[PDB]
Amino acid sequence: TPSQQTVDQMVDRIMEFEEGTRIQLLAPVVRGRKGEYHKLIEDIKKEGYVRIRVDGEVVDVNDPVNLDKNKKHNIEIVVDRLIVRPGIQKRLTDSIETVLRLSNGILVVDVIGGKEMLLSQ
């Protein structure tokens, strides 16, 4: 043993949580980098996504934002804000698939009130 997870494995791992928990699926496009990051934000907004969390705070992509070019920022795209209950396998799998496609094999599950976890292919 050298975490390589498939879509089904990630779905099962998320399903292992208790019912009623609030989770958010994130696609981190930038992890530990410094830059103005304006063209990327414009492209993300044009793609269709509206919710983006920066520095751990959720902000709207439409509203203008400011960030230091010499300070590291963790830009993450909020894709879905689901609930944990039986029968949401299809929507959860679709959201995980689009997150993996957008972030190139990196998925971050934000457990509201719990410890965050990271799953990768």
């Binding site: 498939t6 879509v7 089904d8 494995q9 779905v11 396998q89 299809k90 799998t93 292919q121």
Partner: protein
């Protein structure tokens, strides 16, 4: 580019050509009878045309186990890494194995035998023609998804024969076969001879480069070549019906046919 010749006359009497060559068949884990015969493309299109696949935004490549769009990543689309456990070795993830055509997903369709697929696909004509040809060559017991690496020589040869003989016939096509008997028992030869004679009776023309006497004795015309191999050959030693060739003293094929007819 063709070979060295002056000219060929009579091409205006034909409208198509279908050829089975004397070449090895490649064995890969990504190949099976369904993919080789080209019917898996139609099956995948049918599956991708369903309402569930449209709702989930799937395409024909999603249902291919060689495409990294819907295949299981734990087994890398092969099913075995020891059989896979997350996808149970089916090479498809759980979401792909939910689009059902006539209440059956792609894995069970791949798990059908040719005889089963004859009844299941009895309405779609494009699939039915290929499945019927596979049944005709005598491969009714084979599975549509059996790995080509686990196919025998005769089974692979018959899959190739069905692939090439399941094509459209316009009544003026030319069939060329280069020793299609390799690895075939006397019953499979009987089946192939019946198929070829039905094709000829449909108005077509069949040319077979054969060494089998059972096939030869049923031929209407024979063009012997020789009298030896290499630099000692390249001349027509006999030409006519099998009896006329048998009447030729210096022809080996005639000598061997004399004891058969």
């Amino acid at each position: 580019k063709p070979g060295e010749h002056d000219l060929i006359k009579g091409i205006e009497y034909l409208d198509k050509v279908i050829d089975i060559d004397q070449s090895p068949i490649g064995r890969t884990p990504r190949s099976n009878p369904a993919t080789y015969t080209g019917v898996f493309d139609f099956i995948r299109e049918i599956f991708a045309n369903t309402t569930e696949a449209k709702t989930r935004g799937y395409k024909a490549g999603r249902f291919s186990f060689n495409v990294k769009g819907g295949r299981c990543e734990a087994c890398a689309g092969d099913g075995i890494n020891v059989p896979c456990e997350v996808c149970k070795g089916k090479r498809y993830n759980r979401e792909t194995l939910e689009v059902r055509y006539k209440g059956k997903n792609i894995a069970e369709v791949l798990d059908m035998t040719v005889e089963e697929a004859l009844e299941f696909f009895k309405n779609i004509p494009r699939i039915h023609k290929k499945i019927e040809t596979l049944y005709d060559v005598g491969l009714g017991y084979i599975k549509l998804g059996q790995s080509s690496t686990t196919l025998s020589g005769g089974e692979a040869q018959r899959v190739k024969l069905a692939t090439e003989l399941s094509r459209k016939s316009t009544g003026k096509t030319m069939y060329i076969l280069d020793e299609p008997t390799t690895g075939l028992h006397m019953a499979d030869v009987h089946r192939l001879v019946g198929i070829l004679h039905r094709l000829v009776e449909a108005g077509n023309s069949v040319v077979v480069i054969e060494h089998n006497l059972d096939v030869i004795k049923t031929a209407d015309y024979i063009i012997d070549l020789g009298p030896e191999g290499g630099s000692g050959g390249g001349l027509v030693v006999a030409e006519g019906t099998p009896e006329e060739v048998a009447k030729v003293e210096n022809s080996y094929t005639g000598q061997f046919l004399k004891k058969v007819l």
